[PDB]
Paper text:
Fabs 234, 236, 352, and 1488 all recognize the same region on ctCSP, which is similar to the epitope of the previously published mAb1710. Furthermore, all α-ctCSP-binding Fabs share a similar feature of utilizing CDR H3 to insert into the conserved hydrophobic core between the α-helix and CS flap in the αTSR domain. In fact, when we modeled replacement of the 3D7 residues in the crystal structure with H234 haplotype residues, we found that Fab234 can accommodate these mutations with no clashes and may be able to even make similar H-bonds with the mutated ctCSP. Based on the binding study, however, we observed that mAb234 cannot bind to haplotypes with D356N/E mutations and does not seem to bind to haplotypes with an E357 mutation that is not accompanied by mutation at A361.
One site contains a polymorphic region (denoted α-ctCSP) and has been previously characterized, whereas the second is a previously undescribed site on the conserved β-sheet face of the ctCSP (denoted β-ctCSP).
Residue numbers in the entry:
A (entry chain L): 1 to 9, 11 to 95, 95A, 95B, 96 to 106, 106A, 107 to 168, 170 to 200, ...
B (entry chain H): 1 to 52, 52A, 53 to 82, 82A, 82B, 82C, 83 to 100, 100A, ...
C (entry chain A): 310 to 373
The structure:
């Protein structure tokens, strides 16, 4: 029941210091180890026993531990340091391996990119099959985080929505998809339906109608 | 190098079983603590089990005792994880890992494999329903709806159309089925003169579909 | 004197070398620790040693 607390996300610009905190009750009295999980690859131990680098880890990786807060410090951070970092301790005989929730470190190694949005209405085929799906496609955005809302006429539609996580494209920008499922009755009952995609505090709206 | 290669993952039903294997190379396997750690999708690392050199000391995470059994074969340089009575929540990548130190009071994991993928789902195998997404430079595509399991392939004009094609990753629906879309961007001049067909193939169900995409 | 944490981390640092013979002092200056496997427990594989019943520790005073 011992809990290790990490911030879900830290972004940092290249060359600057990335700092990842790990909070726990009396964590200073425990040895802290840090594992790096670069996307797709095997996790790598970057620091163990609070502050010791295994052979092969660059010297820009350092750790601290005192009181209730341990920290992983990555100086002169590089795009390749972009990863999910987990702190970890031994709590007890019956709780020998406890992980933090992980911090996703984003290294902001490219400029911002505002999303392109394509919205498709239900096909006639699908309507004849008695289903209705609206498709909102979102591409070429950076950083890789968007939110997607749907509207009918003018009101929020908070049911029947399925949205993918952002995924990195071949050009290293990101894409996402959102699907709104309706009755073919609903589709015809409303004047219009809208996809609203929000990225960095600005919003794109696309609208379709029967 | 030290090498840890996991195998034996796959897709099973709730109540199903799997046996994972990890083939170790590059170190004195007989002397080291070995471990399994999993990561469920969009969740964090979660330790599964540890086993000492001689197999004498074995620990499990509370949520997994009884259903998972760890074991090793030092002459074969191999670690095993027997998973029985699998639950949807056991869907994760399972990593094999070596540790240094003392299993009873101070050890740490220092080398990890790349993982093997375990999926546990109630969904039944099913080929996709495909529908055209009509252009209303213009965009058009194909909705590949409600298939299981992954993957599906999508090509345009039997492969003759490669430029401006973007097939999006699939959404996993609460139903347990996948849907995805593929869109191609073409000139408004050609629409009417030119035919556009997406070729969808779902090998788990032997479903091949060619849908023509026309405007209204 | 070093805490349990720091003795355990020292044992971790010198696991390859740990013997029935007393270890070096864990420090150059000040007060450190020395460790050894209990001579009775030398048959056990290292990764399985119990901290209380199989390892022995003693303080080592050094120059301040």
């Amino acid at each position: 029941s011992y809990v290790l607390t990490q911030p879900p996300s830290v972004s940092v610009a290249p060359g600057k210091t990335a700092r990842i905190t790990c909070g726990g009750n009396n964590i200073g009295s425990k040895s802290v180890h840090w594992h790096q999980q670069r996307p797709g690859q095997a996790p790598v131990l970057v620091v163990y026993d609070d502050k010791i680098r295994p052979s092969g880890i660059p010297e820009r990786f350092s750790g601290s531990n005192s009181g209730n807060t341990a920290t992983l410090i990555i100086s002169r951070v590089e795009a390749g340091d972009e990863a999910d970092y987990y702190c970890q301790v031994w709590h007890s005989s019956s709780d020998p391996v406890v992980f933090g929730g992980g911090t996703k470190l984003t290294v902001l190694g490219q400029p911002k990119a505002a999303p392109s949005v394509t919205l498709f209405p239900p096909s006639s085929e699908e309507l004849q099959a008695n289903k209705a799906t609206l498709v909102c496609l979102v591409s070429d955005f950076y950083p890789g985080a968007v939110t997607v809302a749907w509207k009918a006429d003018g009101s929020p539609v908070k049911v029947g929505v399925e949205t993918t996580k952002p995924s990195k494209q071949s050009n290293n920008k990101y894409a996402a998809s959102s699907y709104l499922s309706l009755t073919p009755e609903q589709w015809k009952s409303h004047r219009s339906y809208s996809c609203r995609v929000t990225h960095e505090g600005s919003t794109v709206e696309k609208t379709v109608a029967p | 190098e030290v090498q840890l290669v996991e195998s034996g993952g796959g897709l099973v039903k709730p109540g199903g079983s799997l046996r994972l294997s990890c083939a170790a190379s590059g170190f004195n396997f007989s002397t080291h603590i070995m471990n399994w750690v999993r990561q469920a999708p969009g969740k964090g690392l979660e330790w599964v089990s540890s086993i000492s050199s001689s197999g004498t000391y074995i620990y499990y995470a509370d949520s997994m005792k009884g259903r998972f059994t760890i074991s090793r074969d030092n002459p074969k340089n191999s670690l095993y994880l027997q998973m029985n009575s699998l639950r949807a929540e056991d869907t994760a990548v399972y990593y094999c890992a070596r540790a240094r130190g003392f299993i009873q009071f101070h050890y740490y994991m220092d080398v990890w494999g790349k993982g093997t993928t375990v999926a546990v789902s109630s969904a039944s195998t099913k080929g996709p329903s495909v529908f055209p997404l009509a252009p209303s430079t213009a965009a058009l595509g194909c909705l590949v709806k409600d298939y299981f399991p992954e993957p599906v392939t999508v090509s345009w004009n039997s492969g003759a159309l490669t430029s401006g094609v973007h097939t999006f990753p699939a959404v996993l629906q609460s139903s347990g089925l996948y849907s995805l879309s593929s869109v191609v961007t073409v000139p408004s001049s050609s629409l009417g003169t030119q035919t556009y067909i997406c070729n969808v193939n779902h090998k788990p169900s032997n479903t091949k579909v060619d849908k023509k995409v026309e405007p209204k | 004197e070093p805490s349990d944490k720091h003795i355990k981390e020292y044992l971790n640092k010198i696991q390859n070398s740990l013997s029935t013979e007393w270890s070096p002092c864990s420090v150059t200056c000040g007060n450190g620790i020395q460790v050894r496997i209990k001579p009775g427990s030398a048959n056990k594989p290292k990764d399985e040693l119990d901290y209380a019943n199989d390892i022995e520790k003693k303080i080592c005073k050094m120059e301040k």
